[PDB]
RNA sequence: AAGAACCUUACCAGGUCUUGACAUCCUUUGACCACUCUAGAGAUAGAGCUUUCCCUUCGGGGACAAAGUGACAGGUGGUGCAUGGUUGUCGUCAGCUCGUGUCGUGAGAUGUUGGGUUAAGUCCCGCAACGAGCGCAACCCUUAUUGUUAGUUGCCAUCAUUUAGUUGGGCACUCUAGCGAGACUGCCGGUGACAAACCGGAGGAAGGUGGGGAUGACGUCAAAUCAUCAUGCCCCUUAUGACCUGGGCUACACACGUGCUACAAUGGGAAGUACAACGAGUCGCUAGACCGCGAGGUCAUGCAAAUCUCUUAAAGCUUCUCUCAGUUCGGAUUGCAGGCUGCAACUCGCCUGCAUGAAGCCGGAAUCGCUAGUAAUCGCGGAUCAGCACGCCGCGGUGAA
């Protein structure tokens, strides 16, 4: 068969997704969405690229992803899925991009500053 | 009393727990890096001169 | 105090470090070694007008290279005084030592030479105003784009101190593509200590 | 294959042009050379206040970017060994061959 | 601030109920940036709503946020050297905001050791227009227009 | 915290070796801040020179759980 | 002060010195030592092999002692109001100047003023001004996407596997790092003097200085620093200098500034159960195995590092117990028994276990920080350290009005 690769990056994480036609499944680090990842209900979050592109499926997922915390690497799965759905059919690009949900969040943790207590927190300063 | 206490490091100590570290060209006992054997600001002054190899100013 | 060394601003961007090394696990030895090699040079700098000492590292051959505006006055008689430098120098290091003499040209646009010359003339009861003016006029007429000069201390053998100087030619400083030279010199006549600062610009 | 060389220095253009010279000698005087593999460029930090006596609210931080280079040669001859252990210049880069 | 108006920080609806108002209810309750606990207690509170006398819990939320949510407000102003007040309008955004503010105020100290039947019975009884929060809105309307007198000429 | 043997100052140990089988001297003009007590010490009197003057005090058999620096304090708060 | 048993540490109580603890020169020079013991609170007095020319030209020269000798050495002793140097603050505020033309009897002015706009002396229109320079902005670094080049110690898409990317294989991905492209109000519509400019629309990873840094003009405050250093003048220089032992410099009737943990049930306890990035390392990080409730101890393994180790990250998630109390909240203070480092940790170090279990249920007048990956919360790393952190620097997870 022909594999459908997909890359995924958000919040100091990295996701390599391999996509395949099937019945609608998800295997992350050889484990299911409720096995490797806890209670979190990101059904609309992860399968929202299946909101308008082949609604609502059903294709099967193999993905190897590490780095960051739990929700941040789950945010990387959107890039692999929607990018791979772009790779399958170009004609779903407009319906995605009118809702967006394809561009990378270019934002991560702020650099500190010496003298301050945090990246923007200043010390408690008496008037005199 | 610095010039005797410059020579205080140049002798062997009475026992182990007195070998303190200071700068070489000045003699500050505080805030001396153990890698370069230079104090707080003599490191800073020689750093601007472009005479220490390596070191640049850091910004990111 | 709120201004920065341009030599600190431009190191590792458009100019190089002196002691061109790599030193894993033997660094401080060569550091204070090279600092003492730097300290011995006060015999030359008295009257031979050396400027910089570029310091290299062979296998185990010690490599420096001095830059002065007098090639004949450092080589001495036939190569007899340079041998005296090697003899007094190899006692200090204790290694295969070799020195190079690279003749630097155009002394009329540097910072250390011109500034140390006028620091010499400040001791001899010279009007500092016309000293600044003659220095900037001789520096500009050798091809330049700007000179800044400033003197601080107990000027004119007098009361409460000043800090001033005269400057000509449009010198940029707050940019990067500079290739400029800065030098600080001390000079006392009898009252404490006086200092000078000096600036050039010569393109990019 | 019984030769591997590392170049740990500071100025990366001196680094990679000296790497290009020794790869030149390698593919001239033998055969089957790999590429100039780069390495993750370890970096330290330093921090010194911008004053002498007081005024702790303003500092200055310095750094040490040490690039590293890595080159492997596959199935050489002892003639290129004679070329590689005797070619020495430049100077600011580490000069050490290994197995 | 001083130059003029500003942006609005757009939000996204729920994973289940798809409501920005309930999303705002989530992001009000969340203490110290822990969204798992607030989501758990809000979905389980809607489950408690659905068990006893509740069918569309988004709609009983909307009834509660009808009858706690104001229409007017006071504002303690000053003009020329004394501290006064005035019956003032309210934007629809701040109207919902103050409604949620008053609800989560009285959602703190009901007396139940359940972390969510205080919430559940709060919006139930606010849809039943009882509890102190609907009466808080009625006292806000009460203290409005009594100060209409010394504020209509400013 | 030195269960590989409790510690005694050695010249003080020299004098206690000199004075166990012999008679006893109350004058011990040193610090002994690095010398504990264990029950083979009772009967000696020590003038602990605390760096200011020296404080003569004897030894009790329940003055045995500790060192020789309690009895010349260097604070003097009155 | 980026480390405060001793040392550091100048303040003292003793016990000690005078060309000296440290520098230069003449003469004898000179290859100078070390080790053991006697005794001191030691520093030091003394005895035992005692330091031993590296060219010998028939003349001496190097390692430094030790001695004569004086030149002298030395001072954290005073003056930031005699100073060089370096630095705070106004403040990243947006000003500050020059040439030529013109006006004014002259000092001088105009430009740089009026209308709009920007973060801005940034830009447009206008006006006897036309321009330029220092500033602002840009040129530098990091971060947001992608291409090339190079594929091991890195990754595993296509095959066999176990303890596994391992073993073979591959450089597809991912990642590492040199060079590149990409974002410039570049285009659409409206507003506006058509101009500058504001808003909406498109493509795009990024649209309106993308995000973040580094960079601090003219000058003000005789601001701070003779205690890093240098340094005029004043003073000491058988003593304000010198050597060593023992003690402080957190002693506390009290008041003030900064920080940490609580006053619980969005929690507490018990069990099981996932995911970071920055860095650090040979006299150091410790693999594995064993002993102890424990802190730790032993045997012993890889590694001068994309290989080995710190190092299963915490908050997480799923169950079970607790049921609103001065309470399984709280853990201050105290007894006992232990570890760890040096020479011993009673003044004065860090940690473990057991025993007690306070004040304390959100705090007056007032007051502080903060505009988005921020505030709040939770861990981790090291400079320098023997050991010593609620401090500082830095990284990352969750993530709001
Ligand atoms: Zn120094």
Q: What is the DSSP-derived secondary structure letter of residue F47?
A: E
Closest nucleotide (C1' vs CA) to E4 is G198
CB within 8 Å of E69: residues ≥ 6 apart: E95, E96, E98, E99, E137
Do residues C24 and C101 share a domain? yes
At residue B33, the 3 state secondary structure works out as strand
Domain harbouring E105, CATH code: 1.10.455.10
Q: Does C5 map to a domain?
A: no
Query: In the PDB record, what is the listed experimental method?
Result: cryo-EM
Residues 6+ apart with CB under 8 A from C201: C144, C145, C146, C169, C171, C172, C178, C179, C180
Angle, alpha carbons C191-C196-C197 (nearest 5°): 160
Q: How far apart, in whole angstroms, are the C-alpha atoms of residue C6 and residue C176? A: 9
**Of the candidates C105, C133, C155, which is a domain's last residue?**
C105
Q: Do D91 and C24 touch (CB under 8 A)?
A: no
Q: Is A18 left (phi over 0), alpha (psi -120 to 50) or beta?
A: beta
Q: Does residue E11 lie within any of the structural domains? A: no
In terms of CA atoms, which chain B residue is nearest residue C6?
Answer: B48
Q: Which of A69, A99, A86 is nearest to A17 (CA)?
A: A86
Chains E, D in contact, 3 or more Cβ pairs below 8 Å: no
Per the structure, the complete domain to which residue A21 belongs is given by 1-128
Ranges assigned E (strand) in B1-60? 56-57
Q: How buried is C112 (Cβ within 10 angstroms: 0-12 exposed, 13-18 middle, 19+ buried)?
A: buried
Closest among D36, D38, D29 to D87, alpha carbons compared = D29
Smallest CA-to-CA distance from C129 within C105, C103, C155 is with C155
Q: How far is CA E61 from CA E46, E53, E54, F34, in A?
A: 9, 13, 10, 76
For the record, the structure tokens of C70 come out as 């007098």
Number of domains in chain D: 1
Examine residue C154 and state whether it is found in any structural domain, yes or no. Answer: yes
Find the angle CA(F74)-CA(F76)-CA(F78) to the nearest 5 degrees.
170
Cβ atoms F56, F46 nearer than 8 A: yes
By CB atoms closer than 10 A (0-12, 13-18, 19+), residue A22 is: exposed
The backbone region for A86, taken as left when phi is positive above 0, alpha when psi lies in -120 to 50, beta otherwise, is alpha
D79 in contact with B at a CB cutoff of 8 Å?
Answer: no
SS (H, E, C) A66-108: ECCCHHHHHCCHHHHHHHHHHHHCHHHHHHHHHHCCCCCCCCC
Which residues, listed in sequence order, are joined to residue F47 by a DSSP beta bridge?
F56
The Cα of C193 is separated from the nearest Cα of chain D by a number of Å equal to 20
Burial status of residue E110 (CB atoms within 10 A of its CB: 0-12, 13-18, 19 or more) = middle
Residues 82-111 of A with CB under 7 A from strand G: 93-94, 97, 102-111
Q: Using the 8-state DSSP alphabet, how is residue F30 labeled?
A: B
Q: Which residues, in sequence order, are CB contacts of C158 under 8 Å at separation 6+?
A: none
Distance between CA atoms of F60 and F45, rounded to whole angstroms? 10
Q: Looking at the domain assignment, is residue E5 inside a domain?
A: no
Number of domains in chain E: 1
Which nucleotide shows the minimum CA-to-C1' distance to residue E23? G400
C140 plus C95 within the same structural domain = no
B46 is in an annotated binding site: no
Quick one: DSSP state of residue D61?
E
Q: Are C41 and C74 in contact (CB under 8 A)?
A: no
The answer to the question of residue E8 being in a domain is no
Task: Tell me which residue range forms the domain holding C90.
Answer: 16-105
Residue matched to tokens 């009882």 = E130
**Domain match, C185 and C146 both:** yes
Q: Would you say the C-beta of D92 is within 7 Å of strand G?
A: no
Note whether residue E80 is domain-resident: yes
Residues C118 and C59 grouped into a single domain: no
Is C22 inside any structural domain?
yes
Name which of A87, A81, A109, A86 is nearest A97 in CA terms.
A86
Give, in order, the Cα–Cα distances in Å from B54 to each of C21, C27, C48: 8, 11, 30
Give the H or E element holding residue B2.
helix B2-10
Range of the domain at B10: 1-60
CB-based touch E/A (3+ pairs, under 8 A): yes
Size of interface B-C (CB pairs under 8 A): 43
Query: Residue F66: which of F41, F30, F43 has the closest Cα?
Result: F41
According to DSSP, the β-strands at D43-49 and D97-98 are unpaired
D56 touches B: beta carbon within 8 Å: no
- State whether C20 and D93 contact (CB < 8 Å): no
Q: Does C141 contact strand G, using a CB cutoff of 7 Å?
A: no
Q: Is the peptide bond before A56 cis (omega within 30 degrees of 0)?
A: yes
Backbone gaps in chain D, preceding residues (C–N over 2.5 A):
none
Structural domain of E29:
20-143
The minimal CB distance from D64 to the residues B40, B43, B55 is found for B55
CB C171 within 8 A of CB C146: yes
Choosing from C41, C71, C105, the residue where a domain stops is C105
- Output Rg (C-alpha) for chain C, integer angstroms: 19
Measured CA to CA in angstroms, residue C61 lies from A96, C99, C145, D18 at distances of 67, 10, 41, 20
> How many domains in chain A?
1
CB B27 within 8 A of CB B4: no
Tokens at B14, concatenated = 């009475």
Does any CB of chain B come closer than 8 Å to the CB of residue C11? yes
Q: How far away, in angstroms, is E152 Cα from ligand 1 center?
A: 74
Q: D58 at the B interface (CB within 8 A)?
A: no
Whether residue C136 contacts residue C92, with contact meaning beta carbons closer than 8 Å, is answered with: no
> Structure tokens of C155?
């000027």
Residues D87, D81 contacting (CB under 8 angstroms): no
Q: Which residue has the tokens 């905001």?
A: E97
Task: Check: CB of residue A21 under 8 Å from CB of residue A60.
Answer: yes
Distances (CA, A) of C95 to B54, C23, C98: 23, 17, 9
Instruction: Please name the residue that has the structure tokens 């108002």.
Output: E21
Q: Are strands C61-68 and C96-101 parallel, antiparallel or unpaired?
A: parallel
For residue A14, the surrounding DSSP H or E stretch is: strand A14-21
Nucleotides of G strand lying within 7 Å of any protein CB atom: 1-3, 5-10, 12-13, 21-22, 40-42, 74-77, 82-91, 119, 132-146, 149-153, 156-158, 173-179, 203-206, 210-217, 219, 222-225, 227-233, 241-243, 245-248, 251-253, 257-259, 265-267, 274-280, 282, 304-306, 313-318, 323-324, 338-347, 349-350, 367-377, 383-386, 392-401
Which contacts (CB < 8 Å, 24+ apart) does range C194-197 have?
A: C194/C122, C194/C151, C194/C152, C194/C153, C194/C154, C194/C155, C195/C151, C195/C152, C195/C153, C196/C115, C196/C118, C196/C119, C196/C122, C196/C149, C196/C150, C196/C151, C196/C152, C197/C115, C197/C148, C197/C149, C197/C150, C197/C151, C197/C152, C197/C165
Q: What are phi and psi of A98, to 5 degrees?
A: -70, -30
On chain A, the residues whose CB falls within 8 A of the CB of E41 are: none
Residue C101 and residue C121 in one domain: no
Strand (E) or helix (H) holding B40: helix B40-48
Residues in CB range of C138: below 8 A, 6 or more apart = C108, C114
* Minimum CA–CA partner of A116 in chain D: D57
Q: What Rg do the C-alpha atoms of chain F give, in angstroms?
A: 13
Non-local CB neighbours of E112 within 8 Å, separated by 6+ positions? E118, E121
C13: nt with nearest C1' to CA: G140
CA distances from B55 to A113, B3, C13, D47, D61 (A): 21, 31, 12, 12, 10
Nearest-angstrom CA–CA distance, A42 and A71: 9
B23 annotated to a ligand binding site: yes
Quick one: tokens of D13? 């253009």
The Cβ-side half-sphere exposure at C199, using a 13 Å CA radius, reads 19
Chain A residues whose beta carbon lies within 8 Å of the beta carbon of residue D59 = 114-115
- Does B55 sit within 8 Å of D62, measured CB to CB? yes
- Count of residues in chain D: 99
| Pairing mode of beta strands D4-9, D59-65 | unpaired
Answer whether residue C202 is part of any domain.
Answer: yes
Q: In what order do the strands lie in the sheet with D59-65?
A: B56-57, D59-65, D43-49
The stretches of chain E forming alpha helices (DSSP H) are 20-29, 35-51, 57-67, 92-106, 117-127, 132-143
Closest CA to A6 of A103, A77, A90, A106: A77
Number of compact structural domains in chain B: 1
Residue numbers of the domain that contains F20: 1-78
Which residues in E128-153 are b (16+ Cβ under 10 Å) and which e? ebebebbebbeebeeebeeeeeebee
Distance CA A61, CA A74 (A): 13
> Is the CB of residue F53 inside 7 Å of nucleic acid strand G?
yes
- Chain D residues in contact with A115 (beta carbon < 8 A): 57-59
Contact status, residue E82 vs residue E152, Cβ threshold 8 Å: no
The pairing of strands C167-168 and E73-75 is unpaired
Q: Does D57 touch chain B (CB under 8 A)?
A: no
Whole-number CA gyration radius for chain A: 19
Q: Is B56 annotated as belonging to a binding site?
A: no
- Domain tally, chain F: 1
Alpha-carbon distances of A79 from A6, A55, D70, rounded to whole Å: 7, 17, 34
* Residues C52 and C33 both lie in one domain: yes
For residue B34, the 8-state DSSP code is T
The residues facing D49 across adjacent strands are D59
Question: What is the full DSSP assignment across chain C?
Answer: -----HHHHHBTTTB--SB----SS--HHHHHHHHHHHHTTHHHHHHS-EEEEEEEE-SSEEEEEEEES-SHHHHTTTSHHHHHHHHHHHHHH-SEEEEEE-----GGG-SHHHHHHHHHHTTS---HHHHHHHHHHHHHTTS-S-EEEEEEESTTS-SS-EEE--EES----SSS-----EEEEEE-SSSS-EEEEEE-----
CA distances to D28, D32, D34, D47, D73 from D24, in Å: 6, 12, 12, 42, 12
Q: Are E144 and E74 in contact (CB under 8 A)?
A: yes
Measured in angstroms, how far is the CA atom of residue B44 from the centroid of ligand 1?
9
Whether residues C66 and C117 share a domain: the answer is no
Distance between CA atoms of E67 and E132, rounded to whole angstroms?
12
Q: How far apart are CA F56 and CA F69, in angstroms?
A: 12
Distance CA C167, CA C65 (A): 33
For residue E60, the tally of other CB atoms under 10 A from its CB is 21
Nearest CA-CA partner of C163 in C173, C152, C177, C174: C152
Element (H, E) at D64: strand D59-65
Are D81 and D3 a contacting pair, CB within 8 Å? yes
């Amino acid at each position: 068969q022909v594999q459908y690769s997909g890359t995924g990056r958000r919040k100091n994480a990295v996701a390599r997704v391999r996509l395949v036609p099937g019945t609608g499944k998800i295997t992350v680090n050889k484990k299911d969405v409720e096995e490797y990842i806890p209670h979190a209900d990101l059904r609309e979050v992860i399968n929202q690229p299946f909101g308008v592109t082949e609604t609502k499926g059903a294709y099967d997922v193999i993905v190897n992803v590490n780095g960051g915390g739990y929700a941040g690497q789950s945010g990387a799965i959107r890039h692999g899925i929607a990018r791979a759905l772009l790779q399958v059919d170009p004609d779903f690009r407009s319906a995605l991009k009118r809702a967006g949900l394809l561009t990378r969040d270019a934002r991560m943790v702020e650099r500190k500053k010496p003298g301050l207590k945090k990246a923007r927190k200043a010390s408690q300063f008496s008037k005199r | 009393a610095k010039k005797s206490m410059i020579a205080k490091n140049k002798r062997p100590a009475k026992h182990s727990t007195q070998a303190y570290t200071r700068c070489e060209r000045c003699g500050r006992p505080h805030s001396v890096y153990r890698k370069f054997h230079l104090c707080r600001i003599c490191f800073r002054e020689l750093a601007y001169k472009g005479q220490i190899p390596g070191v640049k100013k850091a910004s990111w | 105090g709120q201004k920065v060394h341009p030599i600190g601003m431009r190191v590792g961007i458009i100019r190089d470090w002196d002691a061109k090394w790599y030193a894993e696990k033997e660094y401080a030895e060569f550091l204070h070694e090279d600092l003492r090699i730097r300290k011995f040079i006060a015999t030359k700098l008295a009257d031979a007008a050396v400027s910089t000492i570029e310091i290299e590292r062979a296998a185990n051959r010690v490599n420096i290279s001095i830059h002065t505006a007098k090639p004949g006055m450092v080589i001495g008689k036939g190569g007899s005084e340079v041998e005296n430098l090697r003899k007094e120098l190899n006692k200090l290091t204790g290694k295969r030592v070799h020195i190079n003499i690279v003749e630097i040209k155009k002394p009329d646009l540097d910072a250390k030479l011109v500034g140390e010359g006028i620091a010499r003339q400040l001791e001899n009861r010279v009007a500092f105003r016309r000293a600044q003016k003659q220095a900037i006029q001789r520096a500009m007429r050798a091809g330049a784009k700007g000179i800044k000069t400033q003197v601080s201390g107990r000027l004119n053998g007098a009361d409460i101190a000043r800090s001033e100087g005269y400057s000509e030619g449009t010198v940029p400083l707050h940019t990067l593509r500079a290739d400029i030279d800065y030098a600080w010199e001390e000079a006392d006549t009898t009252y404490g200590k006086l200092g000078v600062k000096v600036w050039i610009y010569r393109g990019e | 294959q019984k030769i591997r060389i590392r170049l740990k220095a500071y100025e990366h253009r001196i680094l990679d042009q000296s790497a290009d010279k020794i790869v030149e000698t390698a593919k001239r005087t033998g055969a089957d050379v790999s590429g100039p593999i780069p390495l993750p460029t370890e970096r330290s930090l330093y921090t010194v206040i911008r004053a002498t006596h007081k005024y702790k609210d303003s500092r200055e931080q310095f750094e040490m970017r040490t690039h590293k280079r890595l080159i492997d040669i596959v199935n050489p001859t002892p003639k290129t060994v004679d070329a590689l252990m005797k070619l020495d210049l430049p100077s600011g880069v580490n000069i050490e061959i290994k197995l | 601030p001083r130059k003029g108006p500003v942006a609005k920080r757009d939000v996204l609806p729920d994973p289940i109920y798809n409501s920005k108002l309930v999303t705002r209810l989530i992001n009000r309750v969340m203490v110290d940036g822990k969204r798992g606990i607030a989501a758990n207690i809000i979905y389980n509170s809607f489950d408690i709503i659905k068990e006893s006398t509740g069918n569309d819990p988004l709609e009983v939320f909307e009834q509660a946020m009808k009858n706690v949510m104001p229409v007017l407000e006071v504002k303690a102003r000053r003009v020329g050297g004394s501290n006064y007040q005035v019956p003032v309008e309210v934007r629809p955004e701040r109207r919902t905001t103050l409604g949620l503010r008053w609800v989560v105020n009285y959602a703190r100290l009901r007396g139940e050791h359940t972390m969510e039947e205080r919430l559940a019975k709060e919006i139930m009884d606010a849809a039943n227009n009882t509890g102190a929060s609907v009466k808080k809105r009625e006292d806000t309307h009460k203290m409005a227009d009594a100060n209409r007198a010394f504020a209509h000429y400013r | 915290s030195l269960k590989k043997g409790p510690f005694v100052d050695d010249h003080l140990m020299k004098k206690v070796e000199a004075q166990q089988g012999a008679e006893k001297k109350k004058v011990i003009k040193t610090w002994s801040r690095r010398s504990t007590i264990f029950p083979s010490f009772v009967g000696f009197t020590i003038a602990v020179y605390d760096g200011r003057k020296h404080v003569p005090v004897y030894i009790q058999e329940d003055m045995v759980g500790h060192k020789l620096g309690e009895f010349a304090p260097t604070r003097t708060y009155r």
